């Protein structure tokens, strides 16, 4: 159907079915250096996102359901507005200021989970 | 609390709660080449460790409990000394000579586990 970013204007729940479409598009000596820098950067950016998913316990997934509650102060909206009316670009603007808080919480709940699972073994 | 390597002088069980602190810090043409080599190497070293965890069945984890027994000949100490008195730098010296043996055993038990799990499906 749609190709890369074709779902950008779609709602969040219509999109998020195309996650593999975007994931797969992330992959004279002076010209050689400029291009190696571009390629090295693409790899480094990719790996930082993968490392981050790993420490949150979401390695290998495109959709990862976590064990952190949603604070209503981050966005006081119902699922109907978020998944049926909004697009991902709009959502990203709405909660930009809470991104680092959420990320810190995700890392911490994984550290606790990982240890509890060791004690049970 | 502590930042990168701040737990280096702490005991092994006090440390190992800071694993994400260290994991996240691993990420004129002549100057361009020297820096690309440094960046390419950082990526290659990172990936070798990740590949190794993968073949041992520990992908995506910071703490991975395996199915290999500990030979008392590698280190004849009780959990109390290892986790409460020793630091990781001291431990690394103590068992340096057994690292390759342990790694070989981890790879082999994973190969057997992976096959048994196929036969059960």
């Amino acid at each position, epitope marked *: 159907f749609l190709g890369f970013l074709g779902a950008a204007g779609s709602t969040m729940g219509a999109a998020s079915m195309t996650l593999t479409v975007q994931a797969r598009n992330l992959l004279l000596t002076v010209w050689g250096i400029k291009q190696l820098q571009a390629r090295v950067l693409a790899v480094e950016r990719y790996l930082r996102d993968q490392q981050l998913l790993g420490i949150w316990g979401c390695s290998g997934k495109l959709i990862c359901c976590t064990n952190v509650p949603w604070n209503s102060s981050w966005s006081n909206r119902n699922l109907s507005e978020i998944w049926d009316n909004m697009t991902w670009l709009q959502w990203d603007k709405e909660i930009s200021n809470y991104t680092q808080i959420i990320y810190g919480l995700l890392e911490e709940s994984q550290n606790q989970q990982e240890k509890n699972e*060791q004690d049970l073994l | 609390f502590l930042g990168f390597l701040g737990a280096a002088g702490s005991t092994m*069980g006090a440390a190992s709660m800071t694993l994400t602190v260290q994991a996240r810090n691993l990420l004129l043409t002549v100057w361009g080449i020297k820096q690309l080599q440094a960046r390419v190497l950082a990526v290659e070293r990172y990936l070798r460790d990740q590949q190794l965890l993968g073949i041992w069945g520990c992908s995506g984890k910071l703490i991975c409990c395996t199915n290999v027994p500990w030979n008392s000949s590698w280190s004849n100490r009780n*959990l*109390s000394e290892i986790w*409460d008195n020793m630091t990781w730098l001291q431990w690394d010296k103590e068992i340096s000579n057994y690292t390759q043996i342990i790694y070989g055993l981890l790879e082999e038990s994973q190969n057997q586990q992976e096959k048994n799990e196929q036969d059960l499906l």
Partner: antibody
Amino acid sequence: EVQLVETGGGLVQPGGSLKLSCRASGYTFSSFAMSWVRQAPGKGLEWVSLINDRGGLTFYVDSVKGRFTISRDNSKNTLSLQMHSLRDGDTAVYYCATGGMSSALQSSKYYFDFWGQGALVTVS
Amino acid sequence: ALTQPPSVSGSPGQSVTISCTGTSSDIGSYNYVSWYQQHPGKAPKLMIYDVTQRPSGVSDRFSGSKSGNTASLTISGLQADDEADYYCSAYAGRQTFYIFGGGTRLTVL
């Protein structure tokens, strides 16, 4: 020398609720797992619940599994046990004890090292 | 759970044995069988843990062992001060963590 002191009400109606607690001292509270054990008025000992040293993992005997909650606060050195519903069969002395589990990075216990004196709870 | 209902007795200086019988998916498979001493009206004290080990502060008059699915507590130089109820318990795996037997009353003659 360590101490474990149980406190809490001792008389309830069936169908109600009761919260017991246990104050600890003389040892690092946070280094040990803890549990509750009942002494029936005229019989033996029964294990009821167990909580991990960090408070994240709890276990229960089937007979109270849907009724009791075990909780821990390491900043106050206390345990608590919240009983709900309550049956006549729950009349017992409830002992606070240290032990029961382990933390997998230290030697195991699987036994109880210290006991308090016990709170007496009667269901009418 | 675990069983041993009878009273147990003997004269000062005589040894006595207190049994504790369980099953295979219990006492047979796990070596975690502690023993507790309780004088009526008092909280229990740990006497033996794991199988044979005693806590510091516990005298050498108390020892124990196991065979098959049966564990036992041995009291050697029996004293009048041993008049207490004795209980055995065991780790019975995950899900069912602990079980206890009824205890036995030790009478010194």
